[PDB]
Nucleic acid binder design. Structure first.
Ligand SMILES: [Mg+2]
Ligand SMILES: [Mg+2]
Lengths: 574, 564
DNA sequence: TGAGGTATGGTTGT
DNA sequence: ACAACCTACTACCTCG
DNA sequence: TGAGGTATGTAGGTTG
DNA sequence: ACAACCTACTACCTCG
């Protein structure tokens, strides 16, 4: 617990001058007139050809450059069709930084000023908003930049160091220094004053409590102390390498885990090979009939297509599988212990759970996956307060990133129904998580149905980009940092390792609900530690979202047609 | 068989003159030169703007008009952008109607000639290839192509009792032929074969599937059905209860009828009652409701489905004398509960038949399969569809769906089928079945691939007497028409057009099994579908999944025909 | 939703 | 473009 | 396919 | 357009 302070990778520069607060307003006339759907990009294009610092404002243009130095008359080309533009100055409109509407226009002007000013910088490498400065192959050093306006009417610089390959992670502290050096170097050159780094109040969240059969510090420990909830299991081994039976150290480790858990284990061997064709599927069917819940596949590294085909084939017989490549030595403990954890999660075992109290006893994550011209919208959930159960539900095919209102609700209803099957009652409050942005009204129906059903809720948008960066004012950088920014918007540093590079905090937006922000940050931060198939490192995303992202990715890869007979408690996609 | 003869709605006109056989070739020069996506359509626009009777041929142009009366130099506004074209005549090339490529060009020229010559008729109503001759207005749709014996061929279809349509077809054929200077049209005859009448079975022989309600079902098992009333009324209407009871008495199977005392208006508590019902054994639900809006219907269906309960809707008000409607609803209910209402009796080359279709009307589709297992079609099954970008079903998807129907046969019969009949709705895209075809060969399963096109088959009229269904008309090698269904009061029939894509089963045997398969469909009591049951089921499967979503089907048995 | 076929904006492929 | 298929809704009439 | 995040560079998408 | 998110593969290092 505790208040503390951090720097963001943003820097206050000079106040907008009186001039800039009243940008020049210009109307645009185009011949011929564009259709209703094509005009906005066209206005933007006009904004560029006019030159100087000019952006679209409403249906027209705003410029910080007087109209005499703009190119008021000229020509454009879009989708084959050629247009002729003329810009008529129409006085200047006083823009106030408080009216977030106006500020947005000022920030657009600010970015254009920055990009533009940077193009005129001598002996430096500029690409859009990137600048490279420090070294027939070469390493280039620099930063990605941004410029907007604070509501008190001053320039804000976001700076983040970056490299350029022309022919790579940075310790956090180094990145912080280079961030400052580059912020001043550019502010002094740009003519925007001396940069002063922005501070924010940060709060240190309580360390979450992870439980196997007993307390653990990492999920891999459940292999020695026992699982959070063990039950009678049967696992099968499929060897693609022509070898023996179970490697003894794998056997001994599984037996040890189950003995500590107080549950019984049956180990099977599949004496079949997929090159047998349909006979192979018969063996699977039999294996399944005999109780096998998941399969460990020992194989030389497989090509993606073979891997996918194999997974899909077992899946079609209701058998999740965990691959572990050979050659395999006993000393490669991390790899094979992670494999083992994978197998157990795919068998429907609860390896770890959290201890502690949280606002919501059901947490659900929503994502969309697939790289083709259609996506899958899907959900994964953590049931009970402890996250005592991890489930997935069948995805749905959709046109794009938006998940249809009815689909969101249906998925949600399945997870609620899972809670009701597992606890005998409805949850009093649910935590709804969305990977990335929530499209307008996407959750409207669902939200209404929960209300109707007497279930309290919170909606939280979780963005993996856009949060910027956070550095301690003093001391070492630790994860579990909560940084409230504006109202209902906050950063959350969930994971950090000194060797990984510099952390990227999540950016969260509280979209609906009245749970205090700090509480949401507490439960989400804690949720990152629930993921069972990573032994030694916690995911950045809370387990519902991490699982959901993996779910839609695997379904995107294998297809949805194989999942009919796969239990929703078996996490086949880890 | 009995051999016989039919007219097609095609008419032989004059042989191509020695001049039409050596069309002029022209080279096209465009400025600027187009990217890959714009060149073929751009040549087509140039073909039209040159005028006369000109078409794309290869990378250039062919005209039956000399270059001197074409607009050899001009411009093309395309996507508002702009190309300048010049055509350079490069002598003529002889074309021969026997090559099928060089011929494809002659037919293209023929269609253009037809369309062009029709525009220049006065005072009739022309729309592309359609003309309307007095009376709204009445007329015909026309086509022109080239036969391999190198003669023009006219398709004419008024745009009716079949006899009327035939008459009008003849009238319009001659009226057009002389007027267009193509000579006197003489209608084409084709040898047609009369297929054996399929033998449908319930508990015993039936002529229609609805008869299984009186004589008993092909295979009955102990069933439980539930009733959901959205109308605020009683219990089971008595006539429905008697009819069901009667059907199961005849079948020798026991029936248990339940009532759901829940309303969907109770939200989740309603889902609980569903779950409870399903545990107790309910297999399907009959829903008595006032007519529902599409969304409410979809939502309701999907909700029951999510608890693994297929549903049959029957609208109130309902009167006992509306026997067709409610008997059909009853047949639906039973198919959705997994009963085999009817099966065929006979010997077919393939003891597994599988249909493939794609559905959905959005930017993506669902590729799905439905099957008839056993030589009698003793089982009808669906498989979980897959999301895909367009009409093409991916090779691996085709094979996976197929493997599930094989596996259904293996679970039912305890062995692999000796030969399968693979049916594709619409055309088969290039190598769509290649992987599946190879897999079957590696498993020692014999196969046939048949493309089934609902349009393109044209029309068939008897030379003499009344028109009856189950007409097989071979055309070229491997292609054939199949008249599967007809009634007088529906209008003139539309033969299916079928292409034997892979396999060595004789065409007549394919036609036999396919024709017979049209009678297997259990949910239509009084009228057989045009498509054979595996394709009809499959078409309906991808339609319903395109409507509800695929997310509801995980707990729904693949023997329960929820989409009928 | 009762069912059937006959009537009147999209995908493949060159 | 365009050839040749297709999607899915509608109304009509009648009940293999 | 061992797992995580952090990095570049692909090659590029959806929402509004 | 473009702003601001995102998809999914890759290599690196190390093992809460
Ligand atoms: Mg994995
Ligand atoms: Mg029905």
């Amino acid at each position: 617990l505790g208040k503390t302070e951090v720097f963001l990778n943003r820097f206050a520069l000079r106040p907008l001058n009186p001039e800039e607060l009243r940008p020049w307003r210009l109307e645009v006339v185009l011949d011929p007139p564009p259709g209703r759907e094509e005009v906005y990009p066209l206005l933007a294009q006009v904004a560029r050809r006019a030159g100087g610092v000019t952006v679209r404002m409403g249906d027209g243009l705003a410029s910080w450059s007087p109209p005499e130095v703009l190119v008021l008359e000229g020509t454009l080309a879009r989708m084959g069709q050629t247009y002729a533009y003329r810009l008529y100055p129409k006085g200047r409109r006083p823009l106030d930084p408080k009216d977030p509407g106006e500020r947005s226009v000022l920030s657009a002007l600010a970015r254009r000023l920055l990009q533009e000013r940077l193009r005129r910088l001598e002996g430096v490498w500029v690409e859009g908003l990137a600048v490279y400065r420090r070294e027939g192959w070469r390493v280039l050093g620099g930063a990605v930049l941004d410029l907007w306006v604070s509501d008190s009417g001053a320039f804000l610089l976001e700076v983040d160091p970056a490299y350029r390959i022309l022919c790579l992670s940075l310790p956090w502290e180094e990145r912080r220094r280079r961030t400052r050096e580059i912020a001043s170097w550019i502010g002094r050159r740009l003519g925007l004053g001396t940069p002063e780094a922005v501070r924010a109040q940060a709060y240190r969240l309580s360390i979450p409590k992870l439980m196997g059969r007993r307390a653990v510090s990492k999920p891999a420990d459940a292999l020695r102390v026992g699982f959070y909830r063990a039950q009678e299991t049967a696992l099968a081994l499929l060897r693609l390498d022509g070898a023996q039976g179970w490697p003894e150290f794998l056997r001994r480790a599984l037996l040890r885990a189950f003995g500590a858990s107080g549950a019984s284990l049956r180990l099977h061997t599949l004496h079949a090979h997929p090159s047998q064709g349909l006979a192979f599927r018969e063996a699977l069917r039999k294996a399944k009939e005999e109780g096998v819940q998941a399969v460990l596949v020992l194989t030389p590294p497989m090509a993606w297509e073979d891997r996918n085909r194999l997974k899909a084939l077992l899946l079609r017989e209701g058998l999740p599988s965990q691959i572990l490549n050979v050659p395999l030595r006993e000393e490669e403990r991390h790899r094979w212990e992670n494999a083992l954890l994978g197998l157990l999660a795919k068998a429907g075992l609860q390896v770890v759970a959290l201890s502690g109290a949280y606002p919501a006893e059901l947490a659900v994550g929503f994502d969309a996956g697939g790289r083709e011209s259609f996506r899958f919208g899907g959900a994964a959930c953590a049931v009970g307060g402890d996250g005592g159960h991890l489930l997935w539900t069948l995805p749905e095919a959709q046109a794009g990133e938006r998940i249809p209102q009815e689909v969101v609700w249906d998925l949600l209803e399945e997870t609620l129904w899972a809670f009701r099957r597992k606890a005998g009652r409805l949850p009093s409050r649910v935590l709804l998580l969305r990977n990335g942005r929530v499209p307008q009204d996407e959750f409207a129906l669902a939200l209404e149905a929960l209300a109707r059903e007497g279930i309290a809720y919170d909606l939280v948008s979780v963005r993996k980009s856009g949060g910027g960066r956070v550095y301690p004012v003093q001391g070492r950088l630790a994860d579990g940092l909560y940084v409230p920014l504006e109202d209902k918007t906050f950063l959350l540093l969930t994971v950090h390792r000194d060797f990984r590079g510099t952390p990227r905090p999540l950016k969260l937006v509280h979209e609906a609900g009245d749970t205090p922000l700090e509480a949401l940050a507490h439960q989400i931060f804690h949720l990152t530690r629930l993921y069972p198939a990573s032994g030694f490192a916690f995911p950045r995303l809370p387990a519902p979202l991490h699982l959901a992202d993996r779910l839609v990715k695997e379904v995107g890869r294998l297809g949805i047609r194989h999942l009919k007979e796969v239990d929703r408690e078996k996490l086949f996609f880890v």
